[PDB]
Amino acid sequence: SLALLLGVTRLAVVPTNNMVTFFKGIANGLSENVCLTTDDFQRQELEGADWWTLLSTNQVIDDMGLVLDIHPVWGKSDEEMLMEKIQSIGVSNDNNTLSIIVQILIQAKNAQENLLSQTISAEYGVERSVVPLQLRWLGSNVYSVLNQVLNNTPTDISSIVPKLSELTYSLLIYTQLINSLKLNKEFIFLRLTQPNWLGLTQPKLSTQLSLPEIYLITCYQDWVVNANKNEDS
Amino acid sequence: RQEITKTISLKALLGESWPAELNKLKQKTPINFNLEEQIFVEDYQELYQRRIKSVSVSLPMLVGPYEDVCAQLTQTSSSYSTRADLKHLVRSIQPNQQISLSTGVNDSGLFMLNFDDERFLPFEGSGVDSSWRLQFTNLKQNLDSLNDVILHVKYTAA
């Protein structure tokens, strides 16, 4: 198991067309009335998207400016960073026309995330609070997975992109990394936020893992239980 | 609240020089208005506050039951979308509403409704400080016998 988890003499798997039924299941779940704002989601000048054309009596500027996407950080992430990012990019109209389009956007961000966190939890047996952190710590992005629908993954040819077919294979080994030992999300959240601050070396911003981490994170996972006071001190 | 009813004649409002000048305004332009205090307030008992409830129009003109009074009324209007900083259509209906005449009598000013509806009546909940227009449109192609225009208003004071 330890050699497999360290990635030496790796596993073999079959690309069964059941995988297309799962990705077509994601595309179906995306398509049936979720009406998602993912239409060319991030990249600058977000033009020609339906939602703010209807609400144009309250604010017109659907194209915005720079990107509408997030990287996690410790202690406080959330919609305050999404607000500060759109507030920083040269909007002089600091009145309610700027704040209302944040409270219009929060449920539209949830409608992108909630699909994966509610569905893949029933494929692989992990809690919905772990899924987006597991996905990024594996070396992936929620939109990059959702874009494979636009790359015609739902087509039942017996071939799909490596970006899915090897990602899916890689997810099972990283699932054993979180079940051959059990740990809580705040550890993953710190490890994903700031590796050198946790105590790692700069190359471990990459997806790669080796024994000098595995000793230290395991002996931490003992010490956090062995200590004479509760979790958070 | 203090519900009040009011009426005015354009001949009585403007004086005889404007029914004379109307020989241009029959064809070239709208007729331009504002309900300023010297007729709406100073000629009546005083008030702290004022909000509209209904309006209507009658047209002193030589028009029979067999013919159409295709004129138009408006309050200065918009249908336009607000744009912030970062670094209309062919006689369509603007959401503020603009009443089109048919009879040349007060039922050209509102249709079907008595004293209730699911929705606010023309100018309901506005102050009287606005500006207004009368335009004949295609009625100007047979306009030959107009004499005066009569307006009616319902509003609440306090």
Next chain:
Amino acid sequence: SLLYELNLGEQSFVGGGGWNDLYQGLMAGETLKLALMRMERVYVEQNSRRQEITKTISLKALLGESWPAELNKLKQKTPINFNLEEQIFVEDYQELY
């Protein structure tokens, strides 16, 4: 009835196939509440007074005196045939979209 009575383009709230044959139709009703919620909100927005107009015409004024003369056939033999073309219904009045 919503899309006819407001004269509106497509929105497709009531999707077919909501039944289930692993779980014998469980949850196949709660989706109809959310369909009615998605539907109702179109009526909450899209109601306002459209430009209500009233009109009248005379067939003598419409057709001219040659047709009240030709009517000596149409009294007995045939219907009288019509179409509300623009030169009396629209071009003789203020324009519209």
